[PDB]
Amino acid sequence: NLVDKTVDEIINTPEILNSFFRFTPAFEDQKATLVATKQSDTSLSVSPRIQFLDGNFYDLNSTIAGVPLNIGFPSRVFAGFAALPAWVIPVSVGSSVGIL
């Protein structure tokens, strides 16, 4: 039932968006998170931020000595999100007035 939330709430709720992937570490206690990016009013994209052997996190924008690494992490799209229920009172009044 996440579809009834705005993309902005989903984007500011990193525990929700850790539930968008399952991660298998190559070495014990290697960690990973998804960075979210708004794509439309109804969709987002996510890309992993993953620790290497040196304890540091790398993602699409990582550099060494200022040179982009361009490692090749994926971007995955999630879509279908709607606006939150601010409309309920005006709408059920409209329906009643219409019926009347």
Partner: protein, 48 residues
């Protein structure tokens, strides 16, 4: 169950509207025809 309260608020008025419009048309259409038949009948009575 119980997820459905917000769509029930959408769905109930729509069904009522559809049922009301149908009821209106079902009563309304013959009432116009009855009137015309009555008039025609009286007109014919007067002619006879």
């Amino acid at each position: 169950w119980a997820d459905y309260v917000l769509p029930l608020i959408v769905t109930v008025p729509i069904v009522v509207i559809i049922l009301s419009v149908t009821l209106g048309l079902t009563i309304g259409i013959p009432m116009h025809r009855n009137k015309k038949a009555l008039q025609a009948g009286f007109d014919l009575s007067n002619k006879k």
